[PDB]
Design a protein around this ligand. Sequence first.
Ligand SMILES: Nc1nc2c(ncn2[C@@H]2O[C@H](COP(=O)(O)OP(=O)(O)CP(=O)(O)O)[C@@H](O)[C@H]2O)c(=O)[nH]1
Ligand SMILES: [Mg+2]
Lengths: 48, 48, 62, 327
Amino acid sequence: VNKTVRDLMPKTIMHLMINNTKEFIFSELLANLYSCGDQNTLMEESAE
Amino acid sequence: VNKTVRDLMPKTIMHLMINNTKEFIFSELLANLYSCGDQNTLMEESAE
Amino acid sequence: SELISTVRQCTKKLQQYPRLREEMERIVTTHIREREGRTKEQVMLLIDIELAYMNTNHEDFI
Amino acid sequence: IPLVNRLQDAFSAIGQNADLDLPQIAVVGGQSAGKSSVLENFVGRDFLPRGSGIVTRRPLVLQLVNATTEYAEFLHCKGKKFTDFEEVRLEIEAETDRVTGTNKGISPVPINLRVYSPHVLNLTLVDLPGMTKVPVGDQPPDIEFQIRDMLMQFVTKENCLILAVSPANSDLANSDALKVAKEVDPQGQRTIGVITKLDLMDEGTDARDVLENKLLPLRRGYIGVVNRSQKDIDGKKDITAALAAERKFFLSHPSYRHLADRMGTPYLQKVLNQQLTNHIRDTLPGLRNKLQSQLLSIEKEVEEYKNFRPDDPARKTKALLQMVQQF
Ligand SMILES: Nc1nc2c(ncn2[C@@H]2O[C@H](COP(=O)(O)OP(=O)(O)CP(=O)(O)O)[C@@H](O)[C@H]2O)c(=O)[nH]1
Ligand SMILES: [Mg+2]
């Protein structure tokens, strides 16, 4: 049981979290990034 | 991967199907049977 | 705790912009903390499956 | 009322040992800037030592918490429940004197105080002594470094919002608050600037260039407040008429009326509320699930409990039958 939990617990987290937040970064980040905030008073130049 | 799917197909079926229908029988069947209408006709005396 | 810091590591240095290293981090981190619930649920349900049959036909010696 | 306050009220109601995990707030500035006055006006109730000279001479770690009705407790008068704020202030100053002395000495040992209120967050306010360079009275010759690192040990930690208090009397370039603010928070992402004493500016001068965030551009902007003068403090002026006078001054001054809406203490309270709202999230999906599972663990019995009427034969007999079967 220890072997079959060690061989399987990385897979479940990395199918539900890694390969899903990565897909979200590919295909949805801009869509909601446009929506959050003003979309106009965003990406304002830092004083530097 | 055949070993790991062969060891977790039974467990997957039963933890969801059998070891849950068993608890349904032992816990919830009585409530449904008593709550369904027309108690007088739920128990029909058979002619025999 | 490690991935959410790696996101910060890859947003702090590319983004000179203010508030665009903030909205980006906020959105990505909220998505990650939304996924942590699902993955914890799946891990718990994997354990609850491994408490169901206790096979012996496998390569344990009888 | 703010939704973060309502959420905290609901959290207190459920009573589970959960918290929104807000960042702490530290108010810092130069000596006689107005730090304690701004802090008490943000709290809403007058319970802080405020006077000319050195007054806030010991780090006061306030904890505003939520409960049914209001009182205050220290960590030395254990069991006692201070209720009237004149007594609270007198106890505060006596506690400061009992270790610092009565010759303007200071002590870095924090005074841990807790206040209860019906509609406040589980905040963590930190009032600190102002920054001085030349020792006065019996202070050690390194009083500057002492105050500096003493407040640095509280500010340099993360999740510590900074209230950089500066008077409108001295030119902004001298601000001991802004020096530390830009030293510990370079990008200015957890720093908020407040300009006090706007009624004490020289004839013909105005703080327009700094309140429009042009003279020293800071990301979060500068909020202008006008507290109660020392004469008003001695005359026991009340918060409501003080705020009315501040509003009148902002509407009457030709150089600020175009920003009167964005100036004032209530705006500062609103801005702190906005920052706390933006900081409580990034954990809600974890917390929403954390108590969603809690709701799951009881929804089953809630089914029996929503519609219970005494003498119901159906429920009574069903319960009897299941009890007998499990027996
Ligand atoms: N007219 C006027 N007086 C103000 C204003 N703000 C503060 N004061 C006065 O500053 C004096 C000290 O106020 P206080 O907030 O206690 O300063 P402090 O920061 O505690 C002094 P330290 O931090 O060094 O211990 C008081 O007399 C107060 O009336 C203001 O906006 N207008
Ligand atoms: Mg003070």
